[PDB]
Each structure stands twice: as C-alpha cells, then as structure tokens.
Design a binder for this molecule. Structure first.
Ligand SMILES: Nc1ccccc1NC(=O)c1ccc(NCC(=O)NCCc2ccc(S(N)(=O)=O)cc2)cc1
Ligand SMILES: [Zn+2]
Length: 258
C-alpha cells in the first residue's frame, strides 16, 4: 500500500507515512502574482546546458525521468537566487487527465496542462542523496506547459514513451538537448520549498519560469498513454500525477521581474 495519486494513496494520505507533508515549507504553492515582490537584487538565472549528457529514460511508476550524467559539471544552473553551482541530474513532468489541470504550481489559481521539473543538486554536498538532506540542497527549475503549438524539442521524448509504457521500464536516451524545452524568457518567481512527492524533503530552492512553453494536444496525449502499473498488472493510466497547492505559511515569493 505504497503512496501514489489514487483515492486511497494520493496526496491527502501522504502525511501518514511522511509527516513533513504538513511542514512549514511544502511545495507546490499558488503564485499570487500581485503579492510576489520584485527583488531587484536577484540575478539573471544562468542555465548552462551546452555540455549536457542525457543517458536514459525511466518510468518509475510516478512519472518518467530523463537522467543525465551528473559525475562532472556538464549541465549546471547558477545565479538567480542561488549560491554556488547546481548540477542537472534529471527532468520529469507532472500532467493531467484533461488540458485544464496537471501543473503543480498554479499562477493566480490557474492550472496549466503540465509542468516540467529540471532537478539540480548543490555540488558543495557531493551527491544527490546528501543534497536532499540540506535546506539548500536542490534547485528545481519549473516550466509550465500549455496546449497549443507543438514543442519540436519535446518530440524525441514523446516518441520513446511507447518503449517505457510501464513501471520499471527504461530505455537508452542519449544526446537529448534540454535547451529545446526552455521558453524564450528566463523571468522567474522563486521561493523556498520541498520535493512535491514523498519523501517531501524541505531541500528545494524553487525557480518557476513566468513564460510557459506550448506543446501540442498530440504530445500531451502521448504522456497520458503511459501506465502507473508494471507490465502484466491491471492497466492504470499515468495521469493526474500532480500534488495540489500547499499552504504558503511564513514564506514570500520573490519575482525577478517587474
Ligand atoms: N538519509 C536521510 C537522513 C535524514 C533525512 C532524510 C534522509 N534521506 C531521505 O529521506 C530519502 C532520500 C531519497 C529517497 N528516495 C529517492 C529520491 O531521490 N527521491 C526524490 C526524488 C524527487 C526529485 C524531484 C522531485 S520534484 N517533483 O520536487 O521535482 C520529487 C522527488 C528516500 C528517502
Ligand atoms: Zn516534479
């Protein structure tokens, strides 16, 4: 009876195994654009992905992860609200059963069709497992997806999904360039928060881009053909793998822009 996104094991249940679910810095949150404060001291984000080395794509039963070689400074996030150098380890998405829901963060209570999370860890902690134990261990770059025109740089991901339909399946996934998933603007909101799935550790500097990317209806339909189940288990479509907005509590969301 493991956590997931169903009626009996979904986000309202998680606090029983992971009491930090009701903590002081949980994610995601609603971004109230009128209460976010412009912070003129915030630096431009530095997204250095030209040497990224993708390795593999994995269906882990909760989402799919595109994994990177994080054994050297090859794809890093710096600047913005961050001190030091954060290495890209993986990206994944959260998405809905319908185009009207799927994002984890909301903007003035608006839900997007999906949300991309580019997960990075602080190199001063040596690897990911140590970084998630620290209040500044991770930086997650969040990008909203809206349904409209196709994102050409997403299609290589969409096309491999039939090879990782079920939980525990992986496939080689080399030479994927995550720059093809970024919007034009790097204007962002930032706040201190958590992992949005168990173990819900309070280790994340969230950086959420203001400008969504557009994907096609056909691209997101292919996300919704994935399965939460393993091969030879009853088929349960991998949809609505999002945690809803959590209380902001004693936090301020800062904006990089006016
Ligand atoms: N060792 C230790 C000591 C004291 C306190 C905590 C820890 N470690 C842990 O709690 C612990 C660490 C990792 C665990 N599992 C693997 C793991 O990497 N999980 C996190 C992956 C994750 C990555 C990104 C996101 S998201 N949606 O916020 O971008 C969500 C989840 C499970 C438990
Ligand atoms: Zn995520």
């Amino acid at each position: 009876h493991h956590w997931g996104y169903g009626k009996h094991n979904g986000p309202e249940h998680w606090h029983k195994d992971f009491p930090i679910a009701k903590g002081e810095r949980q994610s995601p949150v609603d971004i109230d654009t009128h209460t976010a404060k412009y912070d003129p001291s915030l630096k431009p984000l530095s997204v250095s992905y030209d040497q990224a080395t993708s390795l593999r794509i994995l269906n882990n039963g909760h989402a799919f992860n595109v994994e990177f070689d994080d054994s050297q400074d090859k794809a890093v996030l710096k600047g913005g609200p961050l001190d030091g150098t954060y290495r890209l380890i993986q990206f994944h998405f959260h998405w809905g059963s319908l185009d009207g829901q799927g994002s984890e963060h909301t903007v003035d209570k608006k839900k997007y069709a999906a949300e991309l999370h580019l997960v990075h860890w602080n190199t001063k902690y040596g690897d990911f497992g140590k970084a998630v134990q620290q209040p500044d261990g991770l930086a997650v770059l969040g990008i909203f997806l809206k349904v409209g025109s196709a994102k050409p740089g997403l299609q290589k991901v969409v096309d491999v999904l039939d090879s990782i339909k079920t939980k525990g399946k992986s496939a080689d996934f080399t030479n994927f360039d995550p720059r093809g998933l970024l919007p034009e603007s790097l204007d962002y909101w930032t706040y201190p928060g958590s992992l949005t799935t168990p173990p819900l550790l309070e280790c994340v500097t969230w950086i959420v881009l203001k400008e969504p990317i557009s994907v096609s209806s056909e691209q997101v339909l292919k996300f919704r053909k994935l399965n939460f189940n393993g091969e030879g288990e009853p088929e349960e479509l991998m949809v609505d793998n999002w945690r809803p907005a959590q209380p902001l509590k004693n936090r301020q969301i800062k904006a990089s822009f006016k």
